[PDB]
Design a protein around this ligand. Sequence first.
Ligand SMILES: [Mg+2]
Ligand SMILES: [Mg+2]
Ligand SMILES: [Mg+2]
Ligand SMILES: [Mg+2]
Ligand SMILES: [Mg+2]
Ligand SMILES: [Mg+2]
Ligand SMILES: [Mg+2]
Ligand SMILES: [Mg+2]
Ligand SMILES: [Mg+2]
Ligand SMILES: [Mg+2]
Ligand SMILES: [Mg+2]
Ligand SMILES: [Mg+2]
Ligand SMILES: [Mg+2]
Ligand SMILES: [Mg+2]
Ligand SMILES: [Mg+2]
Ligand SMILES: [Mg+2]
Ligand SMILES: [Mg+2]
Ligand SMILES: [Mg+2]
Ligand SMILES: [Mg+2]
Ligand SMILES: [Mg+2]
Ligand SMILES: [Mg+2]
Ligand SMILES: [Mg+2]
Ligand SMILES: [Mg+2]
Ligand SMILES: [Mg+2]
Ligand SMILES: [Mg+2]
Ligand SMILES: [Mg+2]
Ligand SMILES: [Mg+2]
Ligand SMILES: [Mg+2]
Ligand SMILES: [Mg+2]
Ligand SMILES: [Mg+2]
Ligand SMILES: [Mg+2]
Ligand SMILES: [Mg+2]
Ligand SMILES: [Mg+2]
Ligand SMILES: [Mg+2]
Ligand SMILES: [Mg+2]
Ligand SMILES: [Mg+2]
Ligand SMILES: [Mg+2]
Ligand SMILES: [Mg+2]
Ligand SMILES: [Mg+2]
Ligand SMILES: [Mg+2]
Ligand SMILES: [Mg+2]
Ligand SMILES: [Mg+2]
Ligand SMILES: [Mg+2]
Ligand SMILES: [Mg+2]
Ligand SMILES: [Mg+2]
Ligand SMILES: [Mg+2]
Ligand SMILES: [Mg+2]
Ligand SMILES: [Mg+2]
Ligand SMILES: [Mg+2]
Ligand SMILES: [Mg+2]
Ligand SMILES: [Mg+2]
Ligand SMILES: [Mg+2]
Ligand SMILES: [Mg+2]
Ligand SMILES: [Mg+2]
Lengths: 215, 100
Amino acid sequence: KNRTGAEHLWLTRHLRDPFVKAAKVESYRCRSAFKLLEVNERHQILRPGLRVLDCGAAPGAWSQVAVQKVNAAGTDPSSPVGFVLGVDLLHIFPLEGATFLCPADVTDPRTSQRILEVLPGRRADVILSDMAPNATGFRDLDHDRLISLCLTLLSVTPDILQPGGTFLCKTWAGSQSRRLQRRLTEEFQNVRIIKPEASRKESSEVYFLATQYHG
Amino acid sequence: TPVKAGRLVVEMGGRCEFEEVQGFLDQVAHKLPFAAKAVSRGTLEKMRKDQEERERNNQNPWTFERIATANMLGIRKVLSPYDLTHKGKYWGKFYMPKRV
RNA sequence: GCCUGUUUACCAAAAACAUCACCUCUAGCAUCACCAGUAUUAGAGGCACCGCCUGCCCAGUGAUCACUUGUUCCUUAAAUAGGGACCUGUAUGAAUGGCUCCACGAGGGUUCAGCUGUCUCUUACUUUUAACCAGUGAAAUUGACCUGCCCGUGAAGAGGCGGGCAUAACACAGCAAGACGAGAAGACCCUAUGGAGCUUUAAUUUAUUAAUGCAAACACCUGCAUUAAAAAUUUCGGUUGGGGCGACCUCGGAGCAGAACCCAACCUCCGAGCAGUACAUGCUAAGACUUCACCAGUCAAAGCGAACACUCAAUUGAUCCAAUAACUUGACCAACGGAACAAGUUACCCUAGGGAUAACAGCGCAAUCCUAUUCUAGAGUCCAUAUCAACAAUAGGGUUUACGACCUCGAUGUUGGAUCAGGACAUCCCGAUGGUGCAGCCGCUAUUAAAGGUUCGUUUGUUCAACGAUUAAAGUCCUACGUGAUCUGAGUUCAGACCGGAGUAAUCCAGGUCGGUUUCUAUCUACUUUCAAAUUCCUCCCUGUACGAAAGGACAAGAGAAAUAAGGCCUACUUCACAAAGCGCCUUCCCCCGUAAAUGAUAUCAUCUCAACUUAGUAUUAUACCCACACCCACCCAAGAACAGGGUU
RNA sequence: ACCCCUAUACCUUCUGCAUAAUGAAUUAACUAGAAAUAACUUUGCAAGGAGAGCCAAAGCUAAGACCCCCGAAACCAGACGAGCUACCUAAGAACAGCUAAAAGAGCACACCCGUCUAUGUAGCAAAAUAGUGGGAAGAUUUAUAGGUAGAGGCGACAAACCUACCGAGCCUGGUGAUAGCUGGUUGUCCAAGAUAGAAUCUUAGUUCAACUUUAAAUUUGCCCACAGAACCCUCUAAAUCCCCUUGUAAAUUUAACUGUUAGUCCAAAGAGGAACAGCUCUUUGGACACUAGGAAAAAACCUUGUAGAGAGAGUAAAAAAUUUAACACCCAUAGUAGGCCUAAAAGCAGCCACCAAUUAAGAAAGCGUUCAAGCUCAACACCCACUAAAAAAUCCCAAACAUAUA
Ligand SMILES: [Mg+2]
Ligand SMILES: [Mg+2]
Ligand SMILES: [Mg+2]
Ligand SMILES: [Mg+2]
Ligand SMILES: [Mg+2]
Ligand SMILES: [Mg+2]
Ligand SMILES: [Mg+2]
Ligand SMILES: [Mg+2]
Ligand SMILES: [Mg+2]
Ligand SMILES: [Mg+2]
Ligand SMILES: [Mg+2]
Ligand SMILES: [Mg+2]
Ligand SMILES: [Mg+2]
Ligand SMILES: [Mg+2]
Ligand SMILES: [Mg+2]
Ligand SMILES: [Mg+2]
Ligand SMILES: [Mg+2]
Ligand SMILES: [Mg+2]
Ligand SMILES: [Mg+2]
Ligand SMILES: [Mg+2]
Ligand SMILES: [Mg+2]
Ligand SMILES: [Mg+2]
Ligand SMILES: [Mg+2]
Ligand SMILES: [Mg+2]
Ligand SMILES: [Mg+2]
Ligand SMILES: [Mg+2]
Ligand SMILES: [Mg+2]
Ligand SMILES: [Mg+2]
Ligand SMILES: [Mg+2]
Ligand SMILES: [Mg+2]
Ligand SMILES: [Mg+2]
Ligand SMILES: [Mg+2]
Ligand SMILES: [Mg+2]
Ligand SMILES: [Mg+2]
Ligand SMILES: [Mg+2]
Ligand SMILES: [Mg+2]
Ligand SMILES: [Mg+2]
Ligand SMILES: [Mg+2]
Ligand SMILES: [Mg+2]
Ligand SMILES: [Mg+2]
Ligand SMILES: [Mg+2]
Ligand SMILES: [Mg+2]
Ligand SMILES: [Mg+2]
Ligand SMILES: [Mg+2]
Ligand SMILES: [Mg+2]
Ligand SMILES: [Mg+2]
Ligand SMILES: [Mg+2]
Ligand SMILES: [Mg+2]
Ligand SMILES: [Mg+2]
Ligand SMILES: [Mg+2]
Ligand SMILES: [Mg+2]
Ligand SMILES: [Mg+2]
Ligand SMILES: [Mg+2]
Ligand SMILES: [Mg+2]
């Protein structure tokens, strides 16, 4: 055993968490799926027939939500069939109605080319980003790293994202966040900062949602 | 499946001696839940004869059977009715071969 | 949550309430409220500024108008289906829902930069308190106490019981491990034919009010009846973790007392709540049986009268009361010994109790798990035993178990952290060995070893989980979460509030989120400088050696640097200044025992020997410190709470 | 005096247990069983008794002799309360300074409030202090007088406030409310005295039975021996019922009452979905709630019961045992690599036969080689001897001892 204070605090929080209980009930792989659900309840980012790119897809709960919403699985005959693509360096468990390209990193041009090839029409309607660098124990360093990753995603965005497209990305709060927001404001008409109730109150995590892409 | 003391669990025959089969049979006997041993016709008969001989040979004036049947110290108070038949050889599932 | 504002006086200031604006409902009116008012008004409510979207059950097609249809009548036995009239003076729909947004907030969360003893890691000084002297002088508490420790016993748990051990007696000052430490106030579960508040589609009412009708009276009043509103009185059976969905409560049969009777709770199964044939299924009467009481229930000789007291395991219901001329009849009173008729909810709760309370409540071994051994199948290139290991067995330590072969989720002084740790070894590191599928460095495995040590941070996802950076290693456990009269998160867990779900509601959730009061002056036990023996890492030498084909790369012995720990100190530095401190400086000493070998018998070889024996082997370590005693005026002190101690040549 | 030996405070409660829990600082005083019918006992009179009524098939009259204490939350009636607080009415008062086109504006006094922390917790205080805070021309704060009253008021709903304790104030009365619940229940001595059940809005209680006590009447009671008490299911035991004799002395009936009961543990047999342990439960018996001795302390195991005094004696039960693993020396040619399948299996991948030479060796029992090659074993001589486990947490736990006559 030999649990520390922080270890025990996290563990109690995890056990008492309703979202993990809900995930195990609703056969969701991870709790963070619920965050996307909430976002989709507010802005209706996902519609049937839409093309979805998912980055840092593992363990694939985001892909699960995506395929359910965009009717990628084709459960609803009336609803148009959509496309969901998931990219993560770690191996992802197979899911019906979804394709996973692994191992790949979005930043790499070669991997980007592969994604485009697999994607119908060589473009993606919506991009979802949930990846985060391994927490180093320092808020500043982790913040900078995640901002850098989001900036690289934003740089590679134009090639993959259709005009008027939607982009959701997870960021830790800090100094550089403002700068990123400005850059989003430069490229997207609508920029929103969303903290879902599924996201831990103690956590500094937040979501930048960018809508109506131009240029 | 229940097994009582004195029960033959498995049998074996053929063109072989006891010593040949005894090895693996004893192996199996050890791996059984209850106390068990490999026996031939000869060995079983010898065992029974030795028990009979011990009963006849005993120098102890007092036997469990005698005392139990006659209720000699009011002993039936601490004995089971089954003890009359068991003659003190059997105690629960366990069996004592060393008791006359 | 628009805002300013209001709220639980005395644990909640809020997201709750109110609030402009908007919306719904009700009302055509005077001399005591509304109001000396009148529909742009007034009252009862909902929602919460503004701003932007969201609006038809108005009868259908065809070319305001014809025509079936809708509604009403009549003909028709009555209908079907025919004859006539009307729908053409107007209609709007939401106390509906979403959406941004300016300002604001002791609201909840996140964050930039600085900042600071919050922390690394604490120190110095002042005041209060303190301790001593003088005066005054409480409280909770108290069976009596001449009030020890270890192990055991007492389902846990002992100052007092057993076996050991210890022990001149008395203050004063600290301490909080024990005295299930003290005072209330709790929280949890259960109980009472104990309360109360609230709700209703619980039962019983309509005395009250309002309206209506019928009498009376010639509109009001009175009597009667009906309808509503408003209340009023009273209750909320029993079993089943607890809760939801269910099941059950009476009678008969089997497991089921092996053989007189009785007796197996709970459970596992079955069945019964009739029916058929008589119509003397008439009357009466010895003696008996009996569901362990009573009430009920059962059998029956003889006799009178007839003829030549039915089958079936249960197949059932007291009293009262009602109907009836009598004879009789009447409850799915099934909660089946039966109240004539009464439900929910309480986190606003109350009282009287019981139980946990708190470390037992389930203590001499069935089921299951882990560990070790045994078994020798099977992996391991061949090769059980370098390493791993199937079905099993044995030993030790955990967990579970009496019936809804239903989905749950439980528990809750429950568990984190701080402080200080005591202990075990089943060793994570450091020591010493044996084996290896051990060339060396790393390893794998076992034996021995508890002296010492065993880090700092942070959570994007992870069902007792990680991530980052380290380390010689970041051990597994017991100690009533070890430790709350040393401190502190969260949970049980609640008084306020909202969301999702449930419920007609009150309210609930075994769901989520915000806010939220436990005080203690120490009487006793125990203890308050045991001390004098330190570990580890890294670097260098060996040496780049041995080893190895290279790649790579030791062990002993020695040297140097550190870190920590224990014990001191102030020359400098730093906090500061006759001094106290760390961030500074100084010192730090013995081994461990598992095996590896000689000689050599039982057993003339061999054999390390629970043979006599011989070495590694170290054995009892040892040494260090302390050690003379005026006056006990006074003064001083590097000594000190008091006391004591040192100095006064 | 102490030292020695022996000795687990008292009361009360829980089905049973105390050592658990309850109550007690101590002293003095005060503080808790009230009555009938019917029975019994003792008198009077007696088919009558009684000082009208009433009873009477020996009764009647009289007397004696049996029935506690404290405690709720509540409910209702009649008063008293708005000098606190909630709201309102009448007529008043207060609000520095600075910024502001000027305000339920901002900063900020006084004033009002009470966010957060610390102190305090029998306190300065039955809600305070210090700092920090929110508001501070207004839906503001505040003085005076008046009003609304409990089946109610009042409320920017907090079940808020209504004189420190409001889910319904306070006081008095009804009221000695009621309490199947908790606690208590006061001289001495002796005697008899314990666990089948049924019903119940019932399992914290009560009524009947069972057991227990007393008094009275009368004859059997208990222990028991032959004989006797079922088939079916294919099995089933210890036993039980009935019972002369005998050994014993009790039993039944009558009259009158109370009180007790989910008892606990041990031995045995079982029951709870075909759960060997545990839990729950039934039966038989024992012990315990009654003494003592013993087993380490010890309710339930063993020994033992009928009471006192003794500085006598004989006894009963009554002290655990156990220590465990050696083993052969010597030697081995050959028909042939026995045939089939197999790259080949040649003694040992598999199948069939299992003969045969020396004096004596299995067409080979175990290893080992891709197959071979090899190391054993059985074989001949030689004559040798060969007879089964352990661990834990404060500190091991009587001291010890193999050798004088049960
Ligand atoms: Mg966190
Ligand atoms: Mg507000
Ligand atoms: Mg204001
Ligand atoms: Mg405000
Ligand atoms: Mg207030
Ligand atoms: Mg308050
Ligand atoms: Mg407050
Ligand atoms: Mg509101
Ligand atoms: Mg606020
Ligand atoms: Mg003091
Ligand atoms: Mg004094
Ligand atoms: Mg006092
Ligand atoms: Mg003890
Ligand atoms: Mg003792
Ligand atoms: Mg003291
Ligand atoms: Mg005590
Ligand atoms: Mg009642
Ligand atoms: Mg009542
Ligand atoms: Mg009877
Ligand atoms: Mg019965
Ligand atoms: Mg007859
Ligand atoms: Mg009933
Ligand atoms: Mg009944
Ligand atoms: Mg009955
Ligand atoms: Mg509440
Ligand atoms: Mg108790
Ligand atoms: Mg208790
Ligand atoms: Mg193998
Ligand atoms: Mg438990
Ligand atoms: Mg320690
Ligand atoms: Mg060890
Ligand atoms: Mg623990
Ligand atoms: Mg404590
Ligand atoms: Mg607060
Ligand atoms: Mg001196
Ligand atoms: Mg007391
Ligand atoms: Mg007044
Ligand atoms: Mg007033
Ligand atoms: Mg006025
Ligand atoms: Mg002013
Ligand atoms: Mg203002
Ligand atoms: Mg202001
Ligand atoms: Mg107000
Ligand atoms: Mg409310
Ligand atoms: Mg409330
Ligand atoms: Mg009051
Ligand atoms: Mg009373
Ligand atoms: Mg007696
Ligand atoms: Mg009843
Ligand atoms: Mg009851
Ligand atoms: Mg009761
Ligand atoms: Mg007889
Ligand atoms: Mg019992
Ligand atoms: Mg040989």
